[PDB]
Amino acid sequence: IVGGRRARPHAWPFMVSLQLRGGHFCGATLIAPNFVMSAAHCVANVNVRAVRVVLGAHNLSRREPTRQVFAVQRIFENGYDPVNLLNDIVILQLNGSATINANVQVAQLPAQGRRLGNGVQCLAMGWGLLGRNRGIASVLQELNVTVVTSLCRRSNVCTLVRGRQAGVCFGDSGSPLVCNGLIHGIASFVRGGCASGLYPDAFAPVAQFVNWIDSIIQ
């Protein structure tokens, strides 16, 4: 997240951090106690038998007792198209089931095919790069953004921060877009670099998947 602010610890306890030996590479959502939802592209070409799913994280550079670490048992994809960046969703079934508590809770999804109107105020959030030089976040960042249908396709949900250059960056993929309490996007892709100020960012439209996610978490 470029130009966002430090979230309040565990102010979003459905927020997951997918990690490899060295560190965070993408974000995810706790959609069930034993399932997480992220961006397909994040695990397409990773050794998923190495990936760690860290729940209850806040300051990744720190040591937090708060945290619960799983491993992915299985992946469910729904026809990612890497060359058009279509259906950039996955689900990751964990080798366990977490302990729901204050710092780890399950997100609500919207209803099947709820379409987001232009103008809708949402919150984008991630541990991705803080900007064209500043590295990846230690502390979870959150960003106020708006739904924009211009410069977008209908098979994404697109956000834009008007009048500043701010938005999602590398490693924010997989991360939720929470609109009105409900998880409307997953962080897929940027145009022009991050924080272009011109092109909206693009999120996999969760409400277009919901019935699929449902038949998989029940």
Partner: peptide
């Protein structure tokens, strides 16, 4: 540009 993030 489209870079996947």
């Amino acid at each position: 540009x489209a870079a996947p993030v």
